[PDB]
Design a protein around this ligand. Structure first.
Ligand SMILES: [C]C1=[C][C]=C([B]([O])([O])[O])[C]=[C]1
Ligand SMILES: [Zn+2]
Length: 258
């Protein structure tokens, strides 16, 4: 498959190879804050990242992934809408060419400058590959980024990007603390959806935090210097690697708050 974000291979084309792109539970969506309802059945959300063990950072030609050792019981997400325990495997971002766009989810149609996705798989299914054959296989914690003050906890990611400029490059990336990317509040919206890139599998419980984190203009500018292309190929800046909002269909978005 040769999908991407361009005019000739972008989101409007994905359905030809991945017909699930026009499915009943696709992501992202617009979160209409007035239609989302507080759900008192939601349990407290638990983000337990104290033993998170990052290993590596990879430019995969679509974004960059910070990968974790998920071989033991170590950085997990539980509670909220979730039954059981979901283990962190990687995080990545989606971002824009301009500060006015870049997020995948929108909030009352507002687009943020970027969106962080912390990807977790349901341990009852044993591995990520089996989890993505299940309707409750994955949980993704989504966090909006706005441009303002720098995020100190992001700077180690920013600083390593020079070593993974092009598709297929990786670098050791140990001892990174993903707690440094979390906002003060865990208030969230939740709904059932999908991966936002091919293969677009409908296996995700989305947990989208209401409070954005702030990053500096210089931090996001460094993201925009990455390349979609491989080394020695014509330069295509890695920008606008976001899928737009998809039809909500027969879903309800629930709020954890108020
Ligand atoms: C394999 C994979 C994992 C997560 C995502 B995303 O964008 O939905 O977080 C897309 C694809
Ligand atoms: Zn993502």
């Amino acid at each position: 498959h040769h999908w991407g974000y361009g005019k000739h291979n972008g989101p409007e084309h994905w359905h030809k190879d991945f017909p699930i792109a026009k499915g009943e539970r696709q992501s992202p969506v617009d979160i209409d804050t007035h239609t989302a309802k507080y759900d008192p059945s939601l349990k407290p959300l638990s983000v337990s990242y104290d033993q998170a063990t990052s290993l590596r950072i990879l430019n995969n030609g679509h974004a960059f992934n910070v990968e974790f050792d998920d071989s033991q019981d170590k950085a997990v997400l539980k509670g909220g809408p979730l039954d059981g325990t979901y283990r962190l495997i990687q995080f990545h971002f989606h971002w824009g060419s301009l500060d006015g766009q870049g997020s995948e989810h929108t909030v009352d149609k507002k687009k943020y400058a970027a969106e962080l996705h912390l990807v977790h798989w349901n341990t009852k299914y044993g591995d990520f590959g089996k989890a993505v054959q299940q309707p409750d296989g994955l949980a993704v914690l989504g966090i909006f980024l706005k441009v303002g003050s720098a995020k100190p906890g992001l700077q180690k990611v920013v600083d390593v990007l020079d070593s993974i400029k092009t598709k297929g490059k990786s670098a050791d990336f140990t001892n990174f603390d993903p707690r440094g990317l979390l906002p003060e509040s865990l208030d969230y919206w939740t709904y059932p959806g999908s991966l936002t890139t091919p293969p677009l599998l409908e296996c995700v419980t989305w947990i989208v935090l209401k409070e954005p984190i702030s990053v500096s203009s210089e931090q996001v500018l460094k993201f925009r210097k990455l390349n979609f292309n491989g080394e020695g190929e014509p330069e295509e800046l890695m920008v606008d690697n976001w899928r737009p909002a998809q039809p909500l269909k027969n879903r309800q978005i629930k709020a954890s708050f108020k």
